[PDB]
Structures are given as structure tokens and as C-alpha cells.
Write a protein that binds this ligand. Sequence first.
Ligand code: FAD
Length: 563
Amino acid sequence: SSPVAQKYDYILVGGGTAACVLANRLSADGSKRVLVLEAGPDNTSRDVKIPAAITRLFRSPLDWNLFSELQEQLAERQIYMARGRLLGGSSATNATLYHRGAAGDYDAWGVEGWSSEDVLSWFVQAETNADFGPGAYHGSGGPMRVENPRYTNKQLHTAFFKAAEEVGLTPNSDFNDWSHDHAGYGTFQVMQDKGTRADMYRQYLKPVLGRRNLQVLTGAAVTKVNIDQAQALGVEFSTDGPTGERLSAELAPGGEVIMCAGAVHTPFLLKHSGVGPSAELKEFGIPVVSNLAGVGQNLQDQPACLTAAPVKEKYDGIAISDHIYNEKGQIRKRAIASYLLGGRGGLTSTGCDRGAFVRTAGQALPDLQVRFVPGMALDPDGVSTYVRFAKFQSQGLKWPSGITMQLIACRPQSTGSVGLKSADPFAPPKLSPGYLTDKDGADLATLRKGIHWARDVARSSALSEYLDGELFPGSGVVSDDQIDEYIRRSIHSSNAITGTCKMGNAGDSSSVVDNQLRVHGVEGLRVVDASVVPKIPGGQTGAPVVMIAERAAALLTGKATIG
Ligand SMILES: Cc1cc2nc3c(=O)[nH]c(=O)nc-3n(C[C@H](O)[C@H](O)[C@H](O)COP(=O)(O)OP(=O)(O)OC[C@H]3O[C@@H](n4cnc5c(N)ncnc54)[C@H](O)[C@@H]3O)c2cc1C
């Protein structure tokens, strides 16, 4: 009723990060009728604009409220896995930190035409960095905005960097400079524009909403991809929900269907769409169009645990939580005024934007990312505490002052899986994050040795001056067996999720798409989102997505080639 006898050259399933890039590039001439179906609403919320209000998007209408299956290995828990639900997708709901990983992360991909020398100029082509002059590793004209965080906790960030130095770490002045080693302490840059969040809706989609060849519908949840027997021919969606009409959007001659539904819902939509392993599809009575055993496998996610600790009494009031809430739980009016008049203060802060990369056991690249936060966690599950901080507003209590150190296996060997649990295209997928299931216990050994490392740093003379003890895991967690058991019951997601539709050389029976992002054994079907990532890079995964979506877009329209 909105695609009415109209045909599209590109149908984009999803209105997310990679989608917001692609629409911009693909719609940029005038010869292409681009479509962009987003299940979520429009991007118009003030909680999305303000970095600190990310504590309000967890478990919110703007989130898919996805929970994993029972994880036997994780004290028989379901694991909440945040995912954005709106135009801009997860770039609207994320912690905004800007990472590329290391040059060695893309060379180990092994795929042709995507070595570190291949991907570097797409990273830089997409960037306007406020804090690095232009060079081989930093851009000045690209659509993304990147800056150093404009909040600084003068006492507790500097004691963190001293601590790190006291325990023998060396400073990294730029984690995205591939000409030195990835490891060390320092500040993470954030995807922000003078303290306002610069999601991919803001930086890409929004400035081209006036193009007449660009059609973007929200509320439009796609149910499958029409594949006449192989050649895709459209998608089927509903503008109302599970209780709505089953519309259809047609492709024009030589029109392609781009999957941008994320690493959770794209393999999900692929299995419903007849693309998956026959055995899993035969179980729900789904016909098999292409039998690729890679769909839904290889789910990679970076698992986190934390330690938290209160400061001494003499330092009550110097936490970022003291700069955001007052002693009665109301937002400080001064924090609001700095933010609006000047883009400064606690409200520009996703909190976890200072840290380190450490090698725990002399590995080739760092296995451990530390994120330091000068607020105190109140639950061992970091995400939970963030939700608790949102609900804490105006309750009447003082949030206690202290620091949190989050620890993350950033190059984790464990993999997961996404699958079908119901024939209902509107049901939550079968989702198993798979943490701590690698055969060598390597992920577990990183997080445990992260717990020893964070207590070392908390013991340094620079940090012990501020701290009074340790709340999590607590003084009763001393043995190695007690630390792994603390990790198992508290392990949360640092929210990455890659690899569920991986690319690889021709002759890879494990792969889903090829190095040109088109899935094997289907015509005019391609995937351009975090799914294709064959191997998660040491770092938050949003920037590599944009590079994947830019490269894909010039490739489509003739500006670049791969291999
Ligand atoms: C809480 C959180 C914090 C993060 N923090 C950081 C960080 O600090 N730095 C960083 O670099 N990365 C971060 N990430 C990761 C980064 O946000 C994601 O890796 C990236 O945005 C994924 O982009 P994408 O294009 O793969 O998918 P998404 O941005 O997830 O887009 C997929 C879209 O598909 C839509 N969709 C799903 N099903 C359907 C359907 N049936 N019909 C229509 N549309 C559908 C979804 O609503 C969504 O908008 C974070 C992730 C989260 C969740």
C-alpha cells in the first residue's frame, strides 16, 4: 500500500548502521529507486541524542529486548543482548567508542581483497576527526564525526592512567594508528559531534532524506525475501506488526536485495527466506533455496565481567555519577547547563571511554580490553547496573561514589549461533552467545587474568589512594575457581556480535557470502552488515561496519573493485 506497482533497484532490509551508509551512497545519483525498510520507529528521541541517556535505551522500546537461550556454561542463565530498534539501528544505542582494531585483525581474515591494506583507505575516507590532523590514518572530510570525549574526570581518570603505568603498561596515544602496537592505556575516541551522538542516521541518512529516489519506511518489519526458483525478487513486510497486512515490495530488472538487518536478524531472516542449512529449515517446513551451512554459525561476541570499588570517604562526590545525579537522585541542573550551552560535562559521556588493551599471556595481539569507569557498579552485570542507573533517577538516594573496571575478551575464541525457534517470522530467534565454550578455556583465562590485572591496578599507590576496598567480586573471591565462578554468574555482553554470515575465499564450504558480499547460490542477494565479518577485530565493532558499508557501496556503483 506504499510500494504500489513500484519497482526498486535496491531494496535494503533494515534501517541500521550499514543501511544508513548504503542508502546515502546508493541514492546519490538519481537513476536508482532505493528502499529502506526499518522495523523500528524514526530517530527522534532525546535519549538517543544525549550520550549519557544510553542508560535509558537498554531494555526500552528502542531495543529489541532480546534474551539468549539458557546457557549451561553461564550458571544456567539467559543473557540479555542489546540491539538497537530504530533507523540508525545500533549506532543509535551504542557506547559510541571509535575502534578499528589492528592491522593484523584484517590480514587474518584471509579473504582476498580485504587485507589491512585494502580496508585502511575506507576507514579514513569515512572520517572527520576533530583531534587528529589528516594523515594516512585519519580523515578530515568524511561523513562520520569522531572526537576525544569532552568530559574528563580530572582526579579518577588521571589516577587510572598512573595506575596502569605503575603496573608497567605503556601509553598508546592513538588506538587506530596501525603504525604502532595496539596495546597500552589511554583514551578512546567517541563517535560524537561536540557531545551529541553522531549515529549513522545523523551522519548519513538524515542529510539525504530529501532525495526523491530514496524511500524509507519505518514500522516496516520484513518477514522474508522472495526468491523465485535462484534469484531474489523482493521482500514481504507488515507496516503494523504481527497483526497487520502482508505487503510486498518488488524489484526492478537487475535489482538487488541488501541485507542490513544485523548479525542477529539477518541470518534469522535468511533462514526464514529459504537460505540456511536444510536440516534446520526442514524442521519448520521451510523450503531450501541455497543450503549454506554457514548461515547462523560463527556468532562472535566479546564477553565482559567487571570489578567495582568505592572511594574513600574523603573523596565522596568526585565520581561521574556525582556529576550527573545529585544526592536526591535528580539530574544536576549545572550538568544540564554545561551540556546544552557547550557540549561539556557528564552528559557527553558513555562512561567507559578510557581504557587499555593488554596481552594477558604474551599473545600476538591483545586478548584483553579494559574499560575504566569513574562510577561504581552496583551489580556485577554491567548492563544491569546501567538500567539500574536509569531507574535510580529521582528515587531520593545518593548513588555511591567509586570506580568500575570492565574486562572484555576482545579477540575471543568462542563462537555462537543464531537460529529458528518458531515458524512465526515475528518470534525472537534462537540465540546462544556461546561465551566460554572454546575448547582451551582461553576466553575464561583472559577474563580471570583480567580480574587479577584489575586488582593489581586497584592496588597501585595511585589508585589505592582513592579506593576503600572492593565491592565486586569482593574479598571472599580469592581462589582461581572462585573467580571463574564469579565470571560465569556475571558475564555480560560488551555488545559486538559479528560473523553470522561470513565471507571467505571461493571453495570455502564454511562461508555464506563471497568477497563481493553476495551470498552463494542466490542471484541479486547480498549482505552488508556486521554478519559478513569473518573474525571480530579487537575493538568495538561499529566503525568496521561503516567501512564494510562504504566499500560495498562504491563497489556496487562502480567506484572501486575488490581483488
Ligand atoms: C548497547 C551496544 C553498545 C555498543 N557500543 C559500541 C561502541 O561503543 N562502539 C562500537 O563501535 N560499537 C558498539 N556497538 C556495536 C555497534 O553498535 C554495532 O556493531 C553496529 O551498529 C551494527 O551495525 P549493523 O549494520 O551490523 O546493524 P544494526 O545497526 O543492528 O542494524 C540492523 C537493523 O535491522 C533492523 N531489523 C531487524 N529485523 C528487521 C526486520 N524483520 N525488518 C526490518 N528491519 C529489521 C533492526 O531494527 C536494525 O535497525 C554496540 C552495540 C550495542 C548493542
